[PDB]
Amino acid sequence: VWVVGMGIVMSLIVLAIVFGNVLVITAIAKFERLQTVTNYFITSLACADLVMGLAVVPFGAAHILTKTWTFGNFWCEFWTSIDVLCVTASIETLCVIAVDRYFAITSPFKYQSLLTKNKARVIILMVWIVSGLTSFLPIQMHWYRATHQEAINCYAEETCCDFFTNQAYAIASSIVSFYVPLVIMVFVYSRVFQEAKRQLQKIDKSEGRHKALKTLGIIMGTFTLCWLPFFIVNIVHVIQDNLIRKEVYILLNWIGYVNSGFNPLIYCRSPDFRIAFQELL
Ligand SMILES: CN[C@@H]1CCc2c(ccc(O)c2O)[C@H]1O
Known part of the structure; x- marks a missing residue:
């Protein structure tokens, strides 16, 4: 009876993931006002989320729900x-x-000429290139395999898929995928919060005739x-140590998929973007 029960949640997540990115892509595609420099980064994130939800979530859910993997191991590597x-x-x-x-807040005069639409595209291309390299090169060249005789049959056989x-x-x-972005984000957000507190104090100096923390509180916490x-x-x-079990590992990896799916919707809200959604519907 649990097979039908677990299927509903996976189907709902799959249906929601694609719809959470198609709307934003279509809205930003055919609206002049919404186009801006940060819009390119927003579209990059949305496209990455859409590719993830369309590619890995359905097949992974099929693997989890079914007893054993269906087709050959040739496609599993990539x-x-x-x-x-x-x-x-x-x-x-x-x-x-x-x-x-961080660059936008700290230095206002330089921001006008520091970042350009032409120069902004280079960063996204470079980051895609480096991520794709560090993903494909180790996985496909079979440089990640282990020597222990356990599960070596699974690697050799074309019927089971274990990591x-x-x-x-x-x-x-x-280290290269998690820790550096975390420390950079923490430092830059601490600096931003300090600047905001300084500005609020300056405004309160001449007044009489921190809410902004909440805006930060989610953006890092989630x-x-x-x-x-x-x-x-x-x-x-x-x-x-042999403390963890395979089911726990699978569940903690699975939670990240839902986190990535829910991130872009919570991240980008604006009255202009809201009316952009409104016009399409
Ligand atoms: C099988 N799922 C993989 C296993 C390990 C791993 C993942 C994602 C990013 C990484 O840097 C990893 O090392 C997971 O998506």
Whole structure:
């Protein structure tokens, strides 16, 4: 009776993920006003989320719901590669938009000539290139396989799909995909909050005839509680401890998919963008 029960949630998530990006892509495509410099980064994030939801979520849900994998193992390598690539692309896009906000707040005069529409495209292309390289190159060249005789049959056989990684690769991947964006975002947001507090104090100096924290409170919090634990797990099993189980690993990886799906809708709200949605509907 649980098979039908778990199917409903997966189907709802799959239906919602694509609709949460088609609307934004279509609205930003055919509206002149919504076009801006940060709009390119927003579209990059939305397209990455759409690709993730259209590619990895349905097949992964089919694998989880079914007893055993259906087709051959030839496509599995870049299935996993696309998964890791989209995750890295989303994380790095959030890091770069945070850096953009930091540059916007601190130096107003330089921002006019520092960033240009022509120069902005280079950053997105470079980050896509580096994420795609660090995703495809290790996965496809079979540099991530392990030597332990356990599950080597699963790697050899074309009927089961389990994720097994070497000690070295996991740590480097976690460091290059999670920790650096986290520290950069934390530092830049601390600086932004300090600037906002200073401005509020200056305004209060001449008055009499912190709400903004809430605006920050979500934008980082939903990132932490939804992505901090998994990578913390993604290292410990490399250590000699056998504490975690496969089901827990699968569930913590799964939660990240829902987090990535829900991120862009919460991230981008504006009266102009709201009326942009309104006109299309
Ligand atoms: C099988 N799922 C994978 C397993 C490990 C992993 C993921 C995503 C980004 C990474 O940097 C990873 O090391 C997960 O999506």
